[PDB]
Amino acid sequence: GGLGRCIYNCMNSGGGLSFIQCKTMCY
């Protein structure tokens, strides 16, 4: 899928941005 890993790498450790910028941005 995407959201599953999106926030994972984005938030867990692999984004360098924010949460709302990935928890929702990711399609």
From Swiss-Prot:
GO terms for cellular component: extracellular region. The keyword Magnesium does not apply. The cysteine framework is XIV (C-C-C-C). It comes from the Eukaryota. This is Conotoxin vil14a. Its main location: secreted. It is found in: Secreted. Negative results: very weakly inhibits potassium channels in PC12 cells. Very weakly and reversibly inhibits Kv1.3/KCNA3 in HEK293 cells (Ki=12.1 uM). Does not inhibit Kv1.1/KCNA1, Kv1.2/KCNA2 and Kv1.3/KCNA3 when expressed in oocytes (tested at 10 uM). One of its GO terms (molecular function) is toxin activity. Keywords: Cleavage on pair of basic residues, Disulfide bond, Neurotoxin, Secreted, Signal, Toxin. The chain holds residues 91 to 117 of 117 of the full protein. Disulfide bonds join 6-26, 10-22. Belongs to the conotoxin R superfamily. Expressed by the venom duct.
